[PDB]
Structure 1
Amino acid sequence: FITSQSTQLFQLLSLVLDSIGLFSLEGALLENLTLYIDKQVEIAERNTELWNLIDTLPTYTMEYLDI
């Protein structure tokens, strides 16, 4: 469902993976989850950069005189 506030869902996902354990997880699905999160991490890093940004004489010169 996930691969198809959000961190309160993701933190719930992180709890699940710990509940599932290392044995039960399957490689083929693990690749989809690995690819999906890497997309999410890239986005979160992008938004964090945006969030901080919002928080953040010559010796000779020629000029024209105005008469």
Structure 2
Amino acid sequence: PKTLTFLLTHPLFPLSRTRNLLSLLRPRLFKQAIVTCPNLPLNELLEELFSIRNRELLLDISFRILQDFTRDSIKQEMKKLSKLDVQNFIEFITSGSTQLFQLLSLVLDSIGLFSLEGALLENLTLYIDKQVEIAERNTELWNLIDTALPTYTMEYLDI
């Protein structure tokens, strides 16, 4: 739809479809929506993030949300999330970047204190510790890329 891609292209987009267009679009139009849309509801954003459809829309929606939105509000909405897909997401993360790590830190702060199990946390800590090792190695590499006594001599020349 050229008309709908144009009304995406347009900056201002008042109330109605910007309220509920994800129920209408949920491929290519959705990609144009995720790269550009003025107003998007955080619930819809986070539900897409933890939707396991996973066309690197993870990376894209994570970028969109941590660009436009504020961390305290992100905290309360990830608190209003449901824990089972949170396990799904953290399990997927330790399976297998800036926006992604920002999101992992945020959901850790959102869950807080209580409900984290032994296998999950040991797996997470091994993952992040191996990545800290290789990350610091790469940073030191980055710095690297940023960087009289002939008292007696016996020789000969060619004459």
Same fold (TM over 0.5): yes
Q: Percent identity?
A: 99
* SS of residue paired to 1:3: helix
Measured against aligned partners, the alpha-carbon deviations of 1:15-43 in whole angstroms (never above 9, x if no partner) come to 00110112111121000000000011011
Measured against aligned partners, the alpha-carbon deviations of 1:36-65 in whole angstroms (never above 9, x if no partner) come to 000110111011011111110131111121
* SS of residue paired to 1:23: coil
* SS of residue paired to 1:64: coil
TM-score by structure 2 length? 0.40
| Deviation larger for 25-34 or 4-13 | 4-13
CA distance in 2, matches of 1:2, 1:8: 12
- Residue 29 of structure 1, aligned match among 93, 113, 120: 120
Partner of 2:94: 3
| Deviation larger for 21-30 or 4-13 | 4-13
Counterparts in 2 of 1:5 and 1:23: CA distance versus 1, 3 Å: closer
CA distance in 2, matches of 1:30, 1:7: 21
Root-mean-square deviation (Å) = 1.9
| Deviation larger for 32-41 or 22-31 | 22-31
CA distance in 2, matches of 1:8, 1:43: 19
TM-score by structure 1 length? 0.89
Counterparts in 2 of 1:6 and 1:30: CA distance versus 1, 3 Å: same
* SS of residue paired to 1:18: helix
Please identify runs of 4+ aligned residues in structure 1 that moved more than 6 A.
none
- Equivalenced residues, count: 67
Counterparts in 2 of 1:52 and 1:5: CA distance versus 1, 3 Å: farther
Q: How far did residue 7 of structure 1 move?
A: 2.1
